[PDB]
Amino acid sequence: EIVLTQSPGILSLSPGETATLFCKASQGGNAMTWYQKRRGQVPRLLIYDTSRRASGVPDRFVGSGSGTDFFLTINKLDREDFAVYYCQQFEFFGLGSELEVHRTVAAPSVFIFPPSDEQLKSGTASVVCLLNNFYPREAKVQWKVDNALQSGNSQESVTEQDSKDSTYSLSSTLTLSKADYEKHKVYACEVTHQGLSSPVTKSFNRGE
Amino acid sequence: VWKDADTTLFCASDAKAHETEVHNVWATHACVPTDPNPQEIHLENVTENFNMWKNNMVEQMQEDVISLWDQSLQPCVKLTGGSVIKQACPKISFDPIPIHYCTPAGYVILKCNDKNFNGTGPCKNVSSVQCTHGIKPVVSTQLLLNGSLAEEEIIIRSENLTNNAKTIIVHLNKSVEINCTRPSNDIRKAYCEINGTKWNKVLKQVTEKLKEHFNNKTIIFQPPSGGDLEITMHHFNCRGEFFYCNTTQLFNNTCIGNMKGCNGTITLPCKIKQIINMWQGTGQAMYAPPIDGKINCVSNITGILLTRDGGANNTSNETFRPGGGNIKDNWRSELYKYKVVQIE
Amino acid sequence: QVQLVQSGAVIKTPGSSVKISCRASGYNFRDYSIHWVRLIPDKGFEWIGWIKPLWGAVSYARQLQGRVSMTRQLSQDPDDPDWGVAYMEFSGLTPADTAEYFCVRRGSCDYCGDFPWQYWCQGTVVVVSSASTKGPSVFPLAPSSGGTAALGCLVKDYFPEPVTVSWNSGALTSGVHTFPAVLQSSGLYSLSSVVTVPSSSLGTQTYICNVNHKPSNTKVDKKVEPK
Numbered sequence A: 001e002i003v004l005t006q007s008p009g010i011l012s013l014s015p016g017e018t019a020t021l022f023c024k025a026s027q028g029g030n031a032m033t034w035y036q037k038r039r040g041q042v043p044r045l046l047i048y049d050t051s052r053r054a055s056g057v058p059d060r061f062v063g064s065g066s067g068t069d070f071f072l073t074i075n076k077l078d079r080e081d082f083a084v085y086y087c088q089q090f091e092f093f094g095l096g097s098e099l100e101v102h103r104t105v106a107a108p109s110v111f112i113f114p115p116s117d118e119q120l121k122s123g124t125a126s127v128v129c130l131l132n133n134f135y136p137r138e139a140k141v142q143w144k145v146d147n148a149l150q151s152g153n154s155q156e157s158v159t160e161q162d163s164k165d166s167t168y169s170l171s172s173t174l175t176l177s178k179a180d181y182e183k184h185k186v187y188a189c190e191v192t193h194q195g196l197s198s199p200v201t202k203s204f205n206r207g208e
Numbered sequence B: 001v002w003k004d005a006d007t008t009l010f011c012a013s014d015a016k017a018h019e020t021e022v023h024n025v026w027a028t029h030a031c032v033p034t035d036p037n038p039q040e041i042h043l044e045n046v047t048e049n050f051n052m053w054k055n056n057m058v059e060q061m062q063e064d065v066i067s068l069w070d071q072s073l074q075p076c077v078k079l080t081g082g083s084v085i086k087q088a089c090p091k092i093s094f095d096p097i098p099i100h101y102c103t104p105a106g107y108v109i110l111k112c113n114d115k116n117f118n119g120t121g122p123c124k125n126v127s128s129v130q131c132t133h134g135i136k137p138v139v140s141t142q143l144l145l146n147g148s149l150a151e152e153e154i155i156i157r158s159e160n161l162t163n164n165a166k167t168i169i170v171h172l173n174k175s176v177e178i179n180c181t182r183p184s185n186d187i188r189k190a191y192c193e194i195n196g197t198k199w200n201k202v203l204k205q206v207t208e209k210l211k212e213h214f215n216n217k218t219i220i221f222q223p224p225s226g227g228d229l230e231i232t233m234h235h236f237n238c239r240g241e242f243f244y245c246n247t248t249q250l251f252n253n254t255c256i257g258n259m260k261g262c263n264g265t266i267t268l269p270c271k272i273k274q275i276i277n278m279w280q281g282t283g284q285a286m287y288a289p290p291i292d293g294k295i296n297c298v299s300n301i302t303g304i305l306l307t308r309d310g311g312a313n314n315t316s317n318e319t320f321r322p323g324g325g326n327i328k329d330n331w332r333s334e335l336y337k338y339k340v341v342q343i344e
Numbered sequence C: 001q002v003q004l005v006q007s008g009a010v011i012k013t014p015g016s017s018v019k020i021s022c023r024a025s026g027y028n029f030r031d032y033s034i035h036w037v038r039l040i041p042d043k044g045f046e047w048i049g050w051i052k053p054l055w056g057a058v059s060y061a062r063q064l065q066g067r068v069s070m071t072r073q074l075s076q077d078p079d080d081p082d083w084g085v086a087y088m089e090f091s092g093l094t095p096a097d098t099a100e101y102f103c104v105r106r107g108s109c110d111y112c113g114d115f116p117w118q119y120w121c122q123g124t125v126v127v128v129s130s131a132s133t134k135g136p137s138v139f140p141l142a143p144s145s146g147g148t149a150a151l152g153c154l155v156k157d158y159f160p161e162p163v164t165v166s167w168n169s170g171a172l173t174s175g176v177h178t179f180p181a182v183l184q185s186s187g188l189y190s191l192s193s194v195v196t197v198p199s200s201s202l203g204t205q206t207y208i209c210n211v212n213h214k215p216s217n218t219k220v221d222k223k224v225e226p227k
């Protein structure tokens, strides 16, 4: 079988710049195919036979390579070019490289939301921490309950990169039983992010 | 000086004007007489690139055979894209004859004489001829019948072996007769006999050749994974009747690996069908029941058509299944050593 | 223009089989193979197999053999005889088979090989789960106080996807983030929708999130106010 290894995993660049994406095959001598997949859209063939552009593909997409090393070059990046790109040879595929929009670092605004009494009435407590409008996407959110770090009991979700301001938002949801919730006082989410000179903490005291 | 080029070929043959046999009749109207003293010139110091998988001579043969079958093998009923066509469908005389393909003035055929030429890349021993050798337009699936043999070693042909979608042509260097009969006195039931000792030895050699191309992985045969009977069975036409033979016994891994019992006669079960899926891609055709008497044709198996399994594997073996089904491949197996060039 | 149109998304129970159709038109259906490929969350693309429409010859990915069957049907319309339908049936489903399935076809140019897929069906999402259809509970994420405040709705414990969320019946859109749903260990989905607004307005403006879950025929209007 052929193993295709794409890099980098994420590429951060601005409109107008040129992106270079790499695909290394475990076997040499075959031609390379590339696809574009914009978020939520059908995949689109870009390049076949290593360097030939598919139907309706603009000339700023340039495929090249030889042996085991293959490249997709995207000149003068357009807003639409920010997408995930996959390489293929025969039935084998790379795991994809994401091209994302670079912009200035932006610290998240952080908010914490205690669970509602109505949800508590039902036996479960959801505590939510929102990190709004930040860049880059990488952030560390830590839940602490009475200063004990919580792990394995929260789930995160992240928005798609905003099409206009290139920021992300993230939510982390700590889920506890009502009995567990009512045994502790201080609930806090600590956020660590490049845009912050030191970690930011938002918290509340249960029933206060 | 010359250059790769495509042109309209013409055909030559020794068809008889008095024959009612259908290939004879077609060639009489389509072809010219064969040349008694063919000129063949070896080209000294000349190397030439070939590509049997991109050879327009193949397209032209295909069109002719389609033409022949359309003129000659009219079915009692034709079912195409939801339409119906009823016609006379008399029994016929059917027995393919050799057809030569030839270049007109201003062109010539370059022929590759390299003993183990696999159909593509450079040829060092090249000659110039006006016509291909005589090629019988035998339409079959799974097995190539009554064709030419590889001159030295068994040859593996594929446009791209790494590509599981490309048919593999195994070109044998020694033929094995297959003997098919529908006895006189179920009228549609028939069978094909092969010498097991003959065949299993050949098939062993085949698997050994495949190892050379497939990293010495264990070579394993499986039956076709699906499809119409024309492709899941060995399909061919004998005396105008459409045969379908179950080739399961032909690809018995137990035999090729070294056991006992596998020598002696293999008898494939076959059936003649009146309702067939047309290889021309035209739909379904309905023919009258079989003629009476012992329907029998003995052929040389000279080639095998295979597909190889793909997928995210990394097992210790490769799996091959009889198949293909693109009749153009039959013409490729005979035209592989030829290409047309234009003189200036 | 070539067009491949697949059948709609479906929810399947483990142990089920799914049969997906791909109606192909705008070219001679017999002349081109159709492939099937699946895009699996967190694992990428996996080629499933191909079918050649003339004889319906097939080839299945080794690792899926025994679980996949491809067939085709050719148009039976005398004045429109060249289109056809390809079918793929996938059996013994598990949650790991939750993916988007595509039928695809190669380009028709001279240098186009078999695997560069120029034409794609719109995809068919198959979710394999033993979960029962269930509408969401909706809970408030209440604003805790010039500055800007955040508020939202927690949409919890529904199956299957999707739920849609608007605010104030669509009149409020600026600054809304409705997060991708997450699959909880219960097998039920959950998401939040949040919006940032002026702290100044918290006493003057009303905020209502409109939640629609069609699979359960569930509609909820949740008014969210300061805690």
Ligand SMILES: *[C@@H]1O[C@H](CO)[C@@H](O)[C@H](O)[C@H]1NC(C)=O
Pocket (backbone or CB within 6 Å): A030, A031, A032, A049, A089, A090, B159, B160, B162, B163, C113
């Ligand atoms: C092998 O496949 C590649 C595409 O991966 C194709 O470009 C090449 O032509 C194939 N082999 C040959 C030399 O025909």
Ligand SMILES: *[C@@H]1O[C@H](CO)[C@@H](O)[C@H](O)[C@H]1NC(C)=O
Pocket (backbone or CB within 6 Å): B044, B045
């Ligand atoms: C072609 O070249 C070979 C040596 O490379 C020589 O032996 C031969 O005589 C040449 N043929 C002619 C007659 O040009």
Ligand SMILES: *[C@@H]1O[C@H](CO)[C@@H](O)[C@H](O)[C@H]1NC(C)=O
Pocket (backbone or CB within 6 Å): B042, B113, B114, B115, B124, B125, B126, B127
């Ligand atoms: C080329 O073919 C001729 C017969 O046409 C043969 O005598 C000669 O040995 C062959 N040469 C090579 C290099 O295969």
Ligand SMILES: *[C@@H]1O[C@H](CO)[C@@H](O)[C@H](O)[C@H]1NC(C)=O
Pocket (backbone or CB within 6 Å): B118, B119, B120, B121, B122, B156, B157, B158, B161
């Ligand atoms: C045939 O030989 C050519 C030239 O050596 C090579 O490129 C090609 O891979 C070979 N094909 C097969 C199937 O052996």
Ligand SMILES: *[C@@H]1O[C@H](CO)[C@@H](O)[C@H](O)[C@H]1NC(C)=O
Pocket (backbone or CB within 6 Å): B146, B147, B175, B299, B300
């Ligand atoms: C069958 O093969 C033999 C050689 O094994 C050959 O002499 C004969 O011409 C072949 N018969 C055909 C082509 O019908």
Ligand SMILES: *[C@@H]1O[C@H](CO)[C@@H](O)[C@H](O)[C@H]1NC(C)=O
Pocket (backbone or CB within 6 Å): B152, B153, B154, B155, B173, B174, B205, B209
């Ligand atoms: C046929 O080819 C095989 C190699 O593939 C070889 O071992 C055998 O000697 C050949 N038989 C002949 C010359 O007929």
Ligand SMILES: *[C@@H]1O[C@H](CO)[C@@H](O)[C@H](O)[C@H]1NC(C)=O
Pocket (backbone or CB within 6 Å): B179, B180, B181, B193, B298
């Ligand atoms: C072919 O098989 C039939 C019996 O099925 C037999 O009569 C005939 O002798 C066989 N032909 C040859 C030449 O072996």
Ligand SMILES: *[C@@H]1O[C@H](CO)[C@@H](O)[C@H](O)[C@H]1NC(C)=O
Pocket (backbone or CB within 6 Å): B232, B233, B246, B247, B248
């Ligand atoms: C061929 O025969 C075998 C029995 O030996 C049977 O299992 C198989 O279904 C047959 N194949 C076809 C396509 O009829």
Ligand SMILES: *[C@@H]1O[C@H](CO)[C@@H](O)[C@H](O)[C@H]1NC(C)=O
Pocket (backbone or CB within 6 Å): B248, B249, B252, B253, B254, B255, B259, B260, B261, B262, B263
């Ligand atoms: C395979 O060969 C063995 C040994 O001769 C035999 O027992 C078995 O029936 C064969 N299987 C078939 C006919 O496919």
Ligand SMILES: *[C@@H]1O[C@H](CO)[C@@H](O)[C@H](O)[C@H]1NC(C)=O
Pocket (backbone or CB within 6 Å): B195, B196, B197, B198, B263, B264, B265
């Ligand atoms: C099979 O062919 C071998 C020679 O290759 C021969 O000895 C034997 O007679 C044949 N088997 C039968 C049963 O006719």
Ligand SMILES: *[C@@H]1O[C@H](CO)[C@@H](O)[C@H](O)[C@H]1NC(C)=O
Pocket (backbone or CB within 6 Å): B096, B138, B145, B146, B236, B237, B238, B239, B296, B297, B298, B299, B300
């Ligand atoms: C192979 O050739 C012989 C004539 O030499 C013929 O009897 C037999 O029918 C041919 N086979 C086919 C399938 O055309």
